[PDB]
Design an enzyme around this catalytic site. Structure first.
Site, mmCIF file in Angstrom:
data_model
loop_
_atom_site.group_PDB
_atom_site.id
_atom_site.type_symbol
_atom_site.label_atom_id
_atom_site.label_comp_id
_atom_site.label_asym_id
_atom_site.label_seq_id
_atom_site.Cartn_x
_atom_site.Cartn_y
_atom_site.Cartn_z
ATOM 1 N N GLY A 1 -3.748 -8.112 2.618
ATOM 2 C CA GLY A 1 -5.131 -7.864 2.987
ATOM 3 C C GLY A 1 -5.793 -6.804 2.125
ATOM 4 O O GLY A 1 -6.916 -6.986 1.648
ATOM 5 N N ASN B 1 8.814 -8.510 11.538
ATOM 6 C CA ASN B 1 7.851 -7.438 11.351
ATOM 7 C C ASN B 1 6.523 -7.814 12.005
ATOM 8 O O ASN B 1 6.334 -8.954 12.439
ATOM 9 C CB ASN B 1 7.687 -7.150 9.853
ATOM 10 C CG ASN B 1 6.807 -8.162 9.146
ATOM 11 O OD1 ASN B 1 7.175 -9.328 8.989
ATOM 12 N ND2 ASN B 1 5.637 -7.716 8.708
ATOM 13 N N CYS C 1 3.669 -8.809 11.147
ATOM 14 C CA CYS C 1 3.016 -10.028 10.690
ATOM 15 C C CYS C 1 3.993 -11.170 10.445
ATOM 16 O O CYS C 1 3.595 -12.203 9.901
ATOM 17 C CB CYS C 1 2.187 -9.759 9.432
ATOM 18 S SG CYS C 1 1.207 -8.248 9.470
ATOM 19 N N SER C 2 5.259 -11.004 10.829
ATOM 20 C CA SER C 2 6.237 -12.085 10.928
ATOM 21 C C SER C 2 6.665 -12.648 9.579
ATOM 22 O O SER C 2 7.208 -13.756 9.522
ATOM 23 C CB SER C 2 5.715 -13.228 11.805
ATOM 24 O OG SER C 2 5.359 -12.756 13.086
ATOM 25 N N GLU C 3 6.449 -11.927 8.482
ATOM 26 C CA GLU C 3 6.934 -12.443 7.208
ATOM 27 C C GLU C 3 8.348 -11.962 6.896
ATOM 28 O O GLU C 3 9.150 -12.726 6.346
ATOM 29 C CB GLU C 3 5.972 -12.069 6.074
ATOM 30 C CG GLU C 3 5.952 -10.598 5.689
ATOM 31 C CD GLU C 3 4.881 -9.826 6.415
ATOM 32 O OE1 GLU C 3 4.443 -10.291 7.486
ATOM 33 O OE2 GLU C 3 4.476 -8.757 5.911
ATOM 34 N N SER D 1 0.783 -1.235 0.000
ATOM 35 C CA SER D 1 0.000 0.000 0.000
ATOM 36 C C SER D 1 0.819 1.291 0.000
ATOM 37 O O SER D 1 0.418 2.232 -0.707
ATOM 38 C CB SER D 1 -0.969 -0.010 1.192
ATOM 39 O OG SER D 1 -1.834 -1.131 1.132
ATOM 40 N N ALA E 1 7.039 -0.848 3.990
ATOM 41 C CA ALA E 1 5.943 -0.949 4.944
ATOM 42 C C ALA E 1 6.345 -1.582 6.268
ATOM 43 O O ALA E 1 5.758 -1.250 7.303
ATOM 44 C CB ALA E 1 4.790 -1.759 4.340
ATOM 45 N N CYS E 2 7.323 -2.481 6.263
ATOM 46 C CA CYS E 2 7.733 -3.198 7.460
ATOM 47 C C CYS E 2 9.134 -2.773 7.877
ATOM 48 O O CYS E 2 9.992 -2.488 7.037
ATOM 49 C CB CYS E 2 7.692 -4.715 7.238
ATOM 50 S SG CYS E 2 8.322 -5.270 5.638
#
Ligand SMILES: Nc1ncnc2c1ncn2[C@H]1C[C@H](O)[C@@H](COP(=O)(O)OP(=O)(O)OP(=O)(O)O)O1
Ligand SMILES: Nc1ncnc2c1ncn2[C@H]1C[C@H](O)[C@@H](COP(=O)(O)OP(=O)(O)OP(=O)(O)O)O1
Ligand SMILES: [Mg+2]
Ligand SMILES: [Mg+2]
Lengths: 860, 868
Positions: free
Chosen positions: B671, B470, B472-474, B149, B194-195
């Site tokens: 998402g 991060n 969300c752990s990716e 995003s 983003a992360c």
């Protein structure tokens, strides 16, 4: 050039003062060390504080050098650093009070001539000696960070790496950063930091927490006016809305609760002020109220959870004939228990959770309950319990007091009205909040009527105790003088009061010069204005040694008279330093305003009821009539006649002179019967010593008190035994004859033995704890012994709420910064009477105050 | 570097064969409307809404533009600025508007990539740069792939419109000089990352310390980025300070940053702050970390119960005084008021603190007969949940293999101190494992990250171990580094029944280049992140709609074929992406930190390579062997060949020039960008329902069949005559014709007209309801064979009557097939039924470790009070 009033050059600083040795220790149901050496007549609450509050425990070596300087004398040469000894004894801790005394007053006079505050070498020691004499005589003391952090590099050579701490050169005026955190001492404990409507940049919200946490780490306190922060709902330039003032206040409140004052038990001292015209003022006013209700609901809900959730465990194990018990269809009383955990508002999630545990064969539920203890988990859960919260109110808001007008809470971003409200309705919320819990109050127009330098901004905030009120990002150094220790015989040493004030005004400035500040802005702003904070204490301790009540116009007269002398001799001393070294860099900017603060002062010192320029509420004049006047009330007109005349010729070295601080820790090493402007709290107290402590004794204030009045020696022992007791049931109490009396006056039996509370034994074996209804003493001479609280169990008379306030207003017209105070009100106090104390305070010219109703908080 | 065309021609451009049409986007309560939205024809109303309401530049877009000629820059790549002269010919209201078409977004996105890529020397000729410009925009319009995003928000604003602003605290590295710089502008250098993984030191107020971290975290939250940090370096509670005194402990400082995150809205929107908090299993305060959110959920419930009890019981006290006769203080005493003594009795039986009963008594004495005692509830955004702590963080625990071994061996476990390294307290390893099980079972937290599996694939160990992740752990790399993500819609590569592997390789290569150019163009929110991101240049290419692709291929999510396909597609993506990185390092050089980590990264590449060749052995320095590529079960044998060829070429080119990037692939949640790409399923997830709701432009929804259901039954071979009957069984016939339970009547013939047409809403107000509104599942459907039923299993049971769903094991094994070919990790939160036990949650964590999974997280249904 300085004189010599209490010492002689031949005898030094300790001619006439003795010396003893005592032992300080701790232990629970193991910190120790015994060599601690303490001067004459010093208590052990004095001795024991110094032994582990102000002593250094490690880091100084055995015998160490001088250094060649050429500026000024040998006796004030720095000391710097082991093969003499093994690994030990190169590692010694302090042991004598003179070691700290000489390193405090030596580093004072060492830096003192580096700046040239002396004229001749003869003044250096005549000041190095004279000041140590007042430290040994418990005549005065600086703030606690000075009692330790001053002179370790001067007398011992202690040093280490440093950062974050920036200072300025005393000679050049250049901003510098420190390579050492010890060679430039840190004498400041108060700070009024600023904050801008910004998150991530310097001077912003998150930056303030970094600034406050290095303050809290060292042990200093901070106060801030947060009304620069835009309210909840104020838009963001490229985004949405703001969370509001309270959301960021809870970040700082949570940070203050996790950072100890140097690692010890002490909490973090932090003040949070908010203007009355803020949109989020109602959330700010009722902060502690609703958080206190969350504490109440936490304990009620947790216990109700623990009870009901075990009653649901009841029905599944009461079932005998399986585990069909989990089903709310066929069990002995699970349908009754699920509707029993409902019924009491237990959430459905934890009810299914409990029988979810049962399906796994689980025995219990670990649902902790909470209480109302202040160190509990409930108080740590809620917010606000780490901040002192006051409210800035303008005289315009308290001119809508009467007109029942409408109040405008104006937006911060675009200075526009966000919501209108009746002023008394908002004033109603302030009275209710303090009646139930906070906030304190600070009158913005009254404090700025005595602001010495308004061209550098308005007074917006204070320190955690509302005693120091200058510009933002300014520090302050403090010192208070024990008042009664100039009182020998029947007169009071005005010869020594002005010599103490004049000498102590100088040492306070020398650490505006000696200091190393936690930020570069505070470092320069301190150098620019050289703020001072001199005060007194123990005035209530002498006011009955005097022989006259705390609630007495004869007492407020004496209070305002010596408060005028101290501040007047201080301003006149600062004007003497401005002719020799130059006024503070921000003076000429505000030479017209600072001089107006001083003429308004001595107009109030000449007793005049009119003639004030730029004040909102005219200050309480000094009582020329009812002062005892041991050559005093004229002396108050003398100093300000001289301070104004001398300040007109050279300006002033300092922008503020005096304060009134809560001399809690510092008033204990001084053996101050009372602290600050407060009276005494009891006629009966206790006192520790070496092996075991807290043998109860009689407040030595009232033996000398009644000695002042027409009384014979055996004719007041009279009442001490009537107040402290006899320590035995040996002759005619109601619990004598028959049922080993070596309780030795503790003042319990380890009854059910049928004793219709005939505890006149307590009145006999242990004393009435009061002089109310005492032998011989004349009725008109007992109001001079009223204390802060009713003395004893059956004592009924105390100093009223206006007795505390009127004493404050008498002193504030002759003090730069406000007087710190929180007055206890009885449980009977109503919401109308709480605002009555605030409304009376503003009308009397007081800058800041604080209330606490007895039994109002759950922290009881 | 040469860029070829596969989706476009130079004459057709980016939008050849791509039809564009205009829609309307609108939002309101029971506010904002864009009557101007131009989108590609295939885009759904939802994708248009996401684009218009989130990604369109809503203001400041000048209505007249003019190109800024630069030397050496092709004319179609030139910047543009406001045309001030031609803007004055317009009314002041029309001079600066908002974005209006997806073409503007597509053009400024690929324009900035091509512009910055050109200046960075990434293109051999002008033709390659135009091919890249054309192929990039075509894929964006065709929903084949999308960046994260922040790129949609920010990339191209300065390049396309000259939009500019001031900037403080942001930094970048000059691609030409390599020297660190400070940004003058907030838009010229885009912010595509983003992360962020951030470090914190055992220090309070120094830079890189505790209080400074909240400043850094707050900086990310303002822009909309997420933070992750391992806090294990912080002193335990009671550890002495060398300056005297103890430290207040880790949980106290965690409570600070948690309270800060709740007060800062991510991007300033209604969004919450994405924050990841990690603790090592050997930390002395690990027990308070594990049970943190467990206790806070109890505190919420106690607030709900205690406040309502305080309300109820204190109102009754007032009613006892108000209905007293009229002495009102012989009313305030309970000695003269019998009903009042009953109220205080009922108040103290409720354990209400008596300090609060004296207050209401003294309150009534003064004339007030009312009080505001606010009562709280279990809603997630209400006051109770923000009073407690932890709610603003995802709490994960970092487990070592030795701890898991100690749990198997029933050994004891030492909690090491941070200062001296000595044992603070010894604990049984199994009971510590039971708390993690009980905690995650009760309040979803903590999750878990396997330290040794993560660092077994760390390509740069010389610069430290991977310590955190991060939110969300990716993304999993060194501390103080960022990563830009992008996901490919796998389904777009499936048409005419075969997977277009040639275009999939093409999209991977071009988007690998794109993500690398995003590293070169970017500015970062701190000096250390900017330098480290420049030195390692981690990329986060990923995919979505594998579950939608699997359903479209007639394959079940829980099958050997479905797992073998995902493993192959993940192997091709990472293999081609790594080979592309190695080629980029051929022309412009490997990243600055590669030369010292070459033997380490090449080892990781070899394990990836051997995993592709199916070997269940042949891995170098790995604690738990990964799931090798299933050779016999993958439905397309050519994908198994391409995977081996890609990793052969990725290692061969890496042996020659190294790699431009230290990381390359990742599985994000996707998402929001999944909605704009119209992905049926997000990330690695399966589908969730067999019937869905389609959004209408003006407002309201209406249910439709999962578009993958007809495509699935066709692939399996079901005749069109059977397809329509299977669908109408699930979606219903919309309107009461064919019912055999309650239908036609014996009554209305007039109101029947559109009684009946008003039956598609599907609220219906016996099994007559199942007829018109459908069963919403496919079990027990006409014609459908029982061996094809699992092909329509979803993460949740479908409809009120549906009863089968995908197992927790199905989720975990799908992760393990992909994790072997993913640089970082896979963002996943597995939802388990409410009936689950504490042993089953631990078994889920245990199965993930044994299968090479790097991190996982569970949420038992109904476990939190926050869930309505
Ligand atoms: N993301 C956020 N969520 C909530 N409040 C925020 C957020 N960011 C900032 N705020 C609040 C904090 C302050 O009260 C106020 C100003 O913060 P900040 O945006 O840093 O100021 P600024 O001076 O840059 O102004 P502006 O936001 O108008 O550009 O907004
Ligand atoms: N006043 C304090 N109260 C509570 N915890 C504190 C305090 N000061 C520091 N801490 C905590 C924060 C960290 O967890 C840890 C180390 O912080 P800090 O003392 O700033 O580190 P340091 O690097 O200066 O080490 P040291 O204290 O050993 O000299 O102690
Ligand atoms: Mg802003
Ligand atoms: Mg430290």
């Amino acid at each position: 050039k300085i004189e010599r009033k209490f010492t002689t050059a031949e005898g030094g600083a300790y001619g006439g003062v003795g010396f003893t040795t005592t032992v300080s220790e701790i232990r629970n149901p193991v910190f120790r060390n015994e060599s601690v050496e303490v001067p004459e007549g010093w208590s052990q609450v004095a001795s024991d504080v110094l032994a582990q509050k102000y002593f250094r425990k490690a880091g100084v070596p055995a015998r160490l050098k001088r250094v060649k300087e050429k500026g000024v004398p040998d006796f004030l040469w720095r000391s710097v650093p082991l093969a003499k000894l093994p690994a030990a004894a190169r590692f010694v801790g302090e042991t004598s009070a003179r070691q700290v005394f000489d390193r405090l007053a030596g580093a004072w006079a060492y830096w003192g001539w580096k700046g040239g505050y002396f004229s001749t070498e003869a003044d250096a020691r005549a000041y190095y000696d004279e000041m140590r004499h007042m430290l040994a005589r418990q005549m005065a003391a600086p703030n606690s960070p000075q009692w330790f952090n001053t002179g370790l590099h001067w007398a011992y050579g202690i040093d280490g790496p440093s950062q974050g701490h920036f200072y300025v050169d005393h000679a050049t005026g250049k901003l510098q950063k420190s390579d050492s955190a010890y060679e430039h001492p840190q004498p400041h404990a108060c700070f009024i930091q600023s904050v801008q409507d910004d998150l991530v940049n310097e001077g912003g919200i998150m930056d303030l927490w970094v600034r406050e946490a290095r303050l809290f780490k060292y042990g200093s306190g901070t106060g801030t006016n947060f009304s620069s922060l835009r309210g909840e709902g104020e838009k963001l330039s490229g985004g949405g809305k703001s969370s509001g003032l309270m959301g960021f206040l809870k970040i700082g409140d949570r940070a203050a609760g996790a950072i100890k004052s140097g690692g010890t038990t002490r909490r973090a001292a932090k003040m949070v002020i908010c203007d009355m015209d803020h949109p989020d003022i109602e959330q700010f006013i009722n902060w502690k109220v609703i958080e206190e209700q969350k504490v109440a609901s936490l304990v009620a809900g947790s216990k109700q959870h623990e009870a009901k959730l075990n009653d649901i465990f009841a029905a599944i194990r009461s079932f005998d004939g399986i585990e069909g018990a989990t089903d709310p269809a066929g069990n002995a009383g699970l349908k009754t228990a699920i509707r029993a955990a409902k019924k009491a508002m237990i959430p459905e999630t934890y009810i299914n959770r409990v029988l979810q545990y049962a399906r796994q064969g689980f025995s219990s539920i670990e649902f902790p309950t909470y209480d109302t203890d202040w160190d509990s988990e409930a108080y740590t859960t809620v917010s606000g319990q780490n901040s002192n919260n006051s409210v800035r109110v303008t005289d315009a808001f308290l001119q809508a007091v009467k007109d029942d007008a409408d109040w405008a809470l104006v937006r911060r971003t675009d200075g526009k009205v966000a919501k209108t409200i009746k002023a008394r309705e908002l004033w109603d919320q302030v009275g209710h909040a303090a009646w139930a819990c906070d906030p304190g109050i600070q009158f913005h127009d009254t404090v700025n009527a005595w602001h010495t330098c308004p061209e550098d901004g308005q007074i917006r905030g204070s320190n955690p105790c509302s005693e120091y009120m200058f510009l933002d990002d300014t520090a302050c150094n403090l010192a208070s003088m024990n008042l009664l220790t100039f009182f020998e015989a029947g007169r009071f040493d005005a010869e020594g009061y002005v010599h103490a004030t004049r000498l102590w005004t100088v040492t306070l400035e020398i650490s505006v010069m000696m200091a190393q500040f936690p930020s570069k802005e505070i470092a320069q702003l301190s150098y620019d204005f050289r703020t001072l904070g001199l005060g007194y204490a123990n005035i209530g301790g002498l006011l009955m040694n005097m022989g006259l009540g705390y609630d007495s116009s004869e007492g407020r007269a004496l209070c305002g008279a010596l408060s005028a002398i101290m501040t007047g001799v201080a301003y006149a001393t600062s004007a003497e330093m401005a002719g020799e070294l130059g006024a503070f860099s921000g003076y000429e900017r505000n030479a017209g305003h600072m001089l107006r603060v001083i003429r308004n002062h001595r107009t109030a010192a000449h007793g005049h009821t009119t003639g004030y320029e730029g004040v909102n509420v005219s200050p309480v004049a000094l009582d020329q009539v009812n002062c005892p006047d041991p050559r005093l009330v004229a002396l108050a007109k003398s100093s300000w006649d001289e301070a104004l005349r001398l300040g007109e010729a050279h300006g002033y070295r300092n922008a503020q002179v005096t304060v009134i601080a809560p001399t809690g820790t510092i008033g204990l090493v001084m053996d101050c019967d009372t602290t600050g402007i407060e009276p005494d709290f009891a006629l009966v107290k206790f006192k520790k010593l070496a092996g075991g402590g807290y043998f109860k004794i009689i407040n030595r204030s009232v033996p000398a008190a009644l000695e002042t009045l027409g009384y014979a020696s055996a004719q007041i022992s009279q009442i001490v035994a009537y107040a402290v007791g006899h320590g035995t049931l040996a002759n005619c109490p109601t619990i004598s004859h028959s049922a080993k009396i070596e309780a030795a006056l503790p003042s319990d039996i380890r009854l059910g033995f049928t004793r219709a509370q005939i505890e006149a034994a307590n009145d006999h074996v242990c004393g009435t704890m009061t002089l109310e209804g005492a032998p011989h003493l004349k009725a008109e001479h007992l109001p001079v012994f009223d204390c802060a609280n009713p003395c004893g169990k059956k004592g009924k008379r105390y100093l009223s709420v206006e007795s505390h306030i009127h004493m404050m207003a008498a002193a504030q017209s002759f003090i730069s910064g406000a007087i710190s105070k929180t007055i206890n009100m009885p449980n009977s106090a109503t919401i109308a009477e709480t605002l009555a104390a605030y409304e009376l305070s503003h009308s009397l010219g007081i800058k800041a105050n604080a209330l606490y109703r007895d039994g109002s908080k759950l922290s009881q």
